[PDB]
Ligand binder design. Structure first.
Ligand SMILES: *[C@@H]1O[C@H](CO)[C@@H](O)[C@H](O)[C@H]1NC(C)=O
Ligand SMILES: *[C@@H]1O[C@H](CO)[C@@H](O)[C@H](O)[C@H]1NC(C)=O
Ligand SMILES: *[C@@H]1O[C@H](CO)[C@@H](O)[C@H](O)[C@H]1NC(C)=O
Ligand SMILES: *[C@@H]1O[C@H](CO)[C@@H](O)[C@H](O)[C@H]1NC(C)=O
Ligand SMILES: *[C@@H]1O[C@H](CO)[C@@H](O)[C@H](O)[C@H]1NC(C)=O
Ligand SMILES: *[C@@H]1O[C@H](CO)[C@@H](O)[C@H](O)[C@H]1NC(C)=O
Lengths: 428, 125, 426, 127, 127, 426
């Protein structure tokens, strides 16, 4: 053109990938939204988010998962919200008392002196405490060496509700629709979202539970496969059914301490005693392990591939763990990982549960009456790379963050700053 | 729809331009942290928006959406031809290119509106 | 009008039904606003609201008190401020100790700690019998939950608080004197914020409330139901006086670190029973008038008043809180008739908050004989010719005391933008 | 006075209109619930006012109070005669009558404003 | 710079006028008192600015910075000569002088805008 | 002019005296911003304020300090932040136990609980004599209130913090070097964020503060009044060093849950008395100069300095907070004259915060021998020729320690809109 002039457009569609704080939106349908589901209406928007739409044409941008925002904000939200949930109840400090116990080797029958409602009077009580929660004829509770416990009082339920993460006013959420998206590099098939599909904030080590699959075949994700330290995350093309149970018909008794301030404990086992176990269909498991080996054989050039037992160490790190209806399991996965490129697993449970990040406060999960079952869908595996040594893989874990970074991989947060300058034939 | 023309050309996304203006404020929205961390978000949404409207007020374009001005376009700000951008380039590509020189052209408009204000004011004063 | 064109008007007087959060506003004149009166300046705006004006012509609005929600907000405020007030003081958990008592008032003695926790000493104090459950006794609370002393500088004086509407809303009022509580009220006026509302709590009567300029009103949602509670408004108040002639004494016993707990000492002088006095001339006249008015709605039947329903003493007895002490007075002699007086009373120290939801509270004893003078203004009845005539005094939720005042008021949201047709053209 | 003409006819309440615009913001206004429970109300008041002002700004009427605009008045939106409403009925009755058809009007009005912005700026941008 | 002409004459401080109006919003900006005690300041600053902008908008001057108006300047509001203030006094002194009579001027202007738009409304609607 | 018309200008530079809440901005450079320095990033803006510029021409404003706002806002902020810092940790209530002590430092032994509440063991620790009140002894605090240990990760070091005005205000400064504190300062300049202010607490003298470029300044409300405290800014500082040559040791004893408590163990090596050292040449020179200056305001009288007023040791002695330890030094040898040096000192562990309003603190002992090197910059005096000559150092209020730094500063509120006449027409 001959001579042009500045023009100012407001409402231009441009963005800058930035940082912010995102809300949480629940997806409840009843008074469960007000019954404390930990992440209930007391800390999140009630329900009913909008659908997800508006595919965009010809857009391209560089995603990344291993330096994402949403995982750190989710982790801080989980820690703070969980801690706030545990504060307004006991405080089991009276129980740091000399426990006299005498042995079924897993459960020791312990008796101790405790106060009745009158503090000047005392009475004897008996309860069964699991052996890992006890440290030596004299015995004391594990926590007294470290810190004070805090009972997860009733009306709080650990069930993982799906929660949607909705971006605040001004920002927007972008998504990758490429089915074989490997976590990095420019994803062309982009579509904005008002807020995320249901994310189940489950927690589990050495495996993934109830998570989201991938429509196309099995995906493998990592930062730098040339490095052996990084943890691989695998999404399965189809789930494999798993069942866990505690056939012992336990019983719960309440003992009162000081004011109207109770504390539950496991009573006597009615009937016969049996060991809690988990069941995995071996047909599907062998098929899925073979498929994952077939996929892993590609990235590592034409080597053999094998799976060996876990690294060991702390039982929490060395064992798959659950939260199933208020009880915490620690199951051995040795029989699962044995092969190359049904089943029953023995399990043990604890009552004194530290936060599995190791940073939260001690918790005492109360016992739950009646024999309990727990039915789940396994969907992803957490491996670490160890042909005689590069073939073997070891299940690994320990970090809460890696359990969610498998789910928030598609998502990104963008800041809108819509004011654009352009040249054209103008004059005021 | 919101961001419905994010990929189209400059002369194609220039239509509407009110989906991007009607969204920047609207939305669904004991002492608890969830209370404060929402109020921190909301006040930063409104304060970011007012800073945009106040910036259009000084340039005389408040109320307008497309607004001509009187600051010439030196060719050094863009070597690419000035009749090709309007039917080839996406708005984002324009942002990444000319975002280097933003504070120059902003500063000129900060005075090039006050300049004509004085002449209008001195037409009768 | 040949072919008209849309025009947009902003700032136009239209409104809708609303759901918002009202601000209280105290009405103090001195440092009492900072002395924690529960609704002190620590809660909300200090003082000096604007007057109430702007009568509106030809307006009509459809009020309702039983579907109203201002009472809900205020009940939640009541509970929240109660919990906030009791939080930063004891915690009388050391007193759940075996008490040895001997003889209304039992002389109990118990072991307790001095400032050194390793040492102990005996103390004695007089505890009222309803607060004691068994020659070995303990406080009733230890079965249920820990108490919390209403520590000094916290006064239950029911100061008036005005309820003012936030930015962007308005409050509408009914001026029809015979306004029964529902249906359209035409004499509507705007109020920035309401007249002084004294947030008392009482049962089987109303105390210090607001009368009605015209004759006695009777209000209920559905009189054809036998469960709904009537809330009467008297044309003129009835003067009532209550006293505790025993010249009590308070002693302080220290527990653990710097921390005190007051209890009733010995009765200096002679012992007497706390009572209440109601002028019988005015009371008979007012009861007769209320019987005369009630006879209209129930067609030409006899009407009688009978003794209360009974049950829990709190529900079965009228209860004051004035003077920093809680009474429980029998109203049997008060209700006897058809279409002076002295009432015996008993007092308690261990108080469950009268919603039955708040945690236990220990009202400390107050030295010197205490008097208290109030105005009866409203009655809480419940409908039972031989049985429809009988009316029983009623007791229940904290809300019913206050839905007796917040009935004229409505909360309206204004959305001033209107589109109209005319011969405009740009 | 505020709402001082809430009952008068449409032709009388349309005078002034500054009282209804001035009230929507102004007013007298340890961790305690008073804090959050007042700041939420204040921020809601500000957001409602700014949504109203932005909605006027999209229609080109920002700064004005009575603003003529180019959108036909189809008789189906009001069978009542259009010279009678201005001296008979109260504004509330009008709101009750015509609150049904609001979003149609707003959606049409946006494009009718665009047909005053785009053409006027193409008078030079294209010419 | 901000307040860079607080001492200069009325005719000299009348230049710029963007810095003293652009600063009124911008800036650098567990439950803790820091949160409430910062959000209250933020909301107060925002509300003050919106009251100023709304008051400018009632007078028709929104968007402008220097805006002529139709209200006579009665000599009783200033005995000092009206061609001497613009090159002798400082704006602070002017504020001290005229702050007595401010509400009269605001009340006059708030009605003298309705009178202004009365003609425009009648021309474009009443025809 | 013939006929003029009202005109409206926005963005006019006019102001009014203001009353608002000032932010706080730290000046840290490392992880110390997140390590709780009381005034850490947990309660203030992280770092990097803007520079200070924009001198104004021909401006004049009437400053004042003795009725200034910033000092009270800072005092309340300091109290609130401190109380928030001490609450989360212990809770030293278990130690209100009978102590058996034998022999400045008494070797006290006592029974205490191990991790098991039903088991006990003996422990020994050395407690300073001022913290003990009677061969049976208890801590002083059990009579008054419960203490709370200043748990680790908290450092009392006075980092500088910049105060800044919120959106829509500005800060005005006085550049006149001999500004005596009141009356119109002409050399006015604007500031975004105040200069670094060290929030130290120290009675009877000033430490690490800000000097004045010109010669010694003297400040007071009304020197004709005998009661008000004078604040003196020295032209040059004097160098002061304090030490505790005893090589202490700390032992940790556990109580109940994982809840420790540190105490002073046995003194390794030899025992020596904590002392402070002041250069005598500089001190004599500065005292002579201040005496020379003071003769101007009091007409040609002799001037002298005498020993402090006495009373409580905290009021009667000079106290620091060096290395996490609290001192109380005798200043008798310092003030003796008319118009090196060693001062004996004693230290405490049980500190009531020196308003007397903050809650009790137990400062934990610190291992190793402490050194504390400071710049004295200002003095606090009170005027008593035979009696007008003597000047007595005094103090007791932490406010006066800060009203010597916030004297140049004022807070203003902008009123951008202004109306002026000129030729016009719409
Ligand atoms: C545990 O020991 C108690 C004795 O205190 C006894 O009464 C109870 O039956 C025992 N229970 C089991 C399951 O051994
Ligand atoms: C208890 O065990 C039976 C049989 O093993 C099973 O059918 C039942 O579901 C179990 N109880 C629960 C609550 O699952
Ligand atoms: C209560 O009993 C105590 C004995 O513990 C006695 O000293 C006191 O005089 C008694 N008081 C009354 C009022 O009986
Ligand atoms: C105590 O009793 C006397 C006589 O019964 C009465 O005059 C006085 O008012 C009472 N004390 C108080 C504080 O009312
Ligand atoms: C203090 O007394 C204890 C005895 O309880 C003794 O073991 C210790 O050596 C003594 N320490 C000193 C410094 O006297
Ligand atoms: C300990 O004392 C020695 C000699 O008095 C001194 O050099 C050293 O600095 C002291 N320790 C500390 C931490 O200052």
């Amino acid at each position: 053109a001959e001579n042009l002039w500045v023009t100012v457009y407001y409402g231009v569609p441009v963005w800058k990938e930035a940082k912010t704080t995102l809300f949480c939106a629940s997806d409840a349908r009843a008074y469960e939204k007000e019954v404390h589901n930990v992440w209930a209406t007391h800390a999140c928007v009630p329900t009913d988010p909008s659908p997800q739409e508006l595919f965009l044409e010809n857009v391209t941008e560089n995603f990344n998962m291993w330096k994402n925002d949403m995982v750190d904000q989710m982790h801080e939200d989980i820690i703070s919200l969980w801690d706030q949930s545990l504060k307004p109840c006991v405080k089991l400090t009276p129980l740091c008392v000399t426990l006299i116990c005498s042995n079924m080797g897993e459960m020791k029958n312990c008796s101790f002196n405790t106060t009745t409602e009158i503090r000047d009077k005392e009475k004897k009580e008996y309860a069964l405490f699991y052996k890992p929660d006890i440290v030596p004829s004299e015995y004391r509770l594990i926590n007294c060496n470290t810190s004070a416990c805090t009972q997860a009082c009733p009306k709080v339920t650990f069930e993982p509700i799906p929660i949607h993460y909705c971006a605040p006013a001004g920002y927007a959420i972008l998504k990758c629709n490429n089915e074989t998206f490997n976590g990095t590099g420019p994803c062309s098939n982009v579509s904005t979202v008002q807020c995320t599909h249901g994310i189940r904030p489950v927690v589990s080590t050495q495996l993934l539970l109830n998570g989201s699959l991938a429509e196309k075949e099995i995906v493998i994700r990592s930062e730098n496969l040339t490095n052996n330290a990084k943890i691989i995350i695998v999404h399965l093309n189809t789930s494999v059914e798993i069942v866990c149970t505690r056939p012992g018909n336990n019983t719960r008794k309440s003992v009162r301490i000081g004011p109207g301030q109770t504390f539950y404990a496991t009573g006597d086992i009615i009937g016969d005693i049996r060991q809690a176990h988990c069941n995995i269909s071996e047909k599907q498991w062998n098929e899925t392990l073979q498929k994952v080996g077939k996929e892993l054989q590609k990235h590592f050039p034409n080597k053999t591939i094998k799976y060996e037992r876990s690294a060991g160490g702390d039982m929490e790190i060395a064992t798959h763990s659950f939260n199933c209806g208020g009880e915490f399991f620690y199951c051995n996965t040795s029989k699962l990982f044995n092969g190359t490129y049904t089943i029953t697993l023995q399990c043990r449970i604890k009552q004194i549960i530290n936060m599995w990040q190791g940073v939260g406060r001690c918790m005492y999960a109360p016992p739950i009456a009646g024999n309990i079952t727990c039915k789940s869908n396994i969907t992803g595996l957490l491996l670490t790379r160890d042909n005689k040594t590069e073939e073997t893989f070891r299940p690994a874990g320990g970090d809460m963050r890696d359990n969610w970074r498998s789910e928030l991989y598609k998502y990104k947060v963008v800041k809108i700053e819509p004011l654009g300058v352009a040249p054209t034939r103008c004059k005021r | 729809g919101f961001l419905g023309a994010a990929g189209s050309t400059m002369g194609a996304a220039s239509m509407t331009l009110t989906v991007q203006a009607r969204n920047l404020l609207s939305g669904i929205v004991k002492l608890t942290v969830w209370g404060i961390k929402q109020l921190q978000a909301r006040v930063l949404a409104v304060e970011r928006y007012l800073r945009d409207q106040q910036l259009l007020g000084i340039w005389g374009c408040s109320g307008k959406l497309i607004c001509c001005t009187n600051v010439p376009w030196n060719s050094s700000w863009s070597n690419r031809n000035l009749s090709e951008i309007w039917d080839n380039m996406t708005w984002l590509q324009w942002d990444k290119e000319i975002s280097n020189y933003t504070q120059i052209i902003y500063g000129l408009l900060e005075e090039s509106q006050n300049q004509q204000e004085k002449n209008e004011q001195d037409l009768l004063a």
